[PDB]
Amino acid sequence: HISSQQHEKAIKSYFDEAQTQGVIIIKEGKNLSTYGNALARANKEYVPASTFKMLNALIGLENHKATTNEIFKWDGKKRTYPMWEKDMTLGEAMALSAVPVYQELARRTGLELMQKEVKRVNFGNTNIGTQVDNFWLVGPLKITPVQEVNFADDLAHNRLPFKLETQEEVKKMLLIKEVNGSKIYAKSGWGMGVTPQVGWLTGWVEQANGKKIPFSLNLEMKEGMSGSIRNEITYKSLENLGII
Ligand SMILES: N#C[C@@H]1CC[C@@H](NOS(=O)(=O)O)CN1C=O
């Protein structure tokens, strides 16, 4: 019996309180609902940043560039984060958002195959340009929050043009939370090498009954913000709406 006015006000306040500008798009069946404090972001293009790991992994697994058990060794060079200075599978690297592992995977795939596959899947503007190892971080690849939630809807329902097994393997890599019988599958993103910086959390809720509710959160990140604000705003929004 809560009014849509009150839901909208609540979710807007979550973005207002974090002192940023963002949107969260929720999909139920075929209907998109846009919430937040900057609704106009819904159809604007931003770099996907680490959300691209989802598709990079699909492409690599489908094209036999890696397996799910393969350990990508740390080369022993210093990394931005100490947590990345270790050997990891694709799944472990998904959870740690270990860019160097996904860069190696992109390089194995190669520019020609990567462009063909990104085009085939129709992801965002589909332009990867000439640099196979950073196109999702600094451009030219861009995508809208609407496109991101539709991608998540496709993956959640095994509708992407990949083998069922490929989709299931990558979805297993994306489980980030269980809340009162609901599972949240998602990938975060933070485009640090663009200005303004973009933050993402794109995924879906799998409810106890098997129903899947895709979402994409998209906001402006500032130097000094905590990455966990993406998760906190998302969980509060999903809870406010009764999705979890
Ligand atoms: N570089 C870079 C950015 C930010 C640091 C890494 N962590 O990714 S994130 O926490 O999911 O956004 C990987 N990455 C992806 O968006």
Ligand SMILES: [Cl-]
């Ligand atoms: Cl990445």
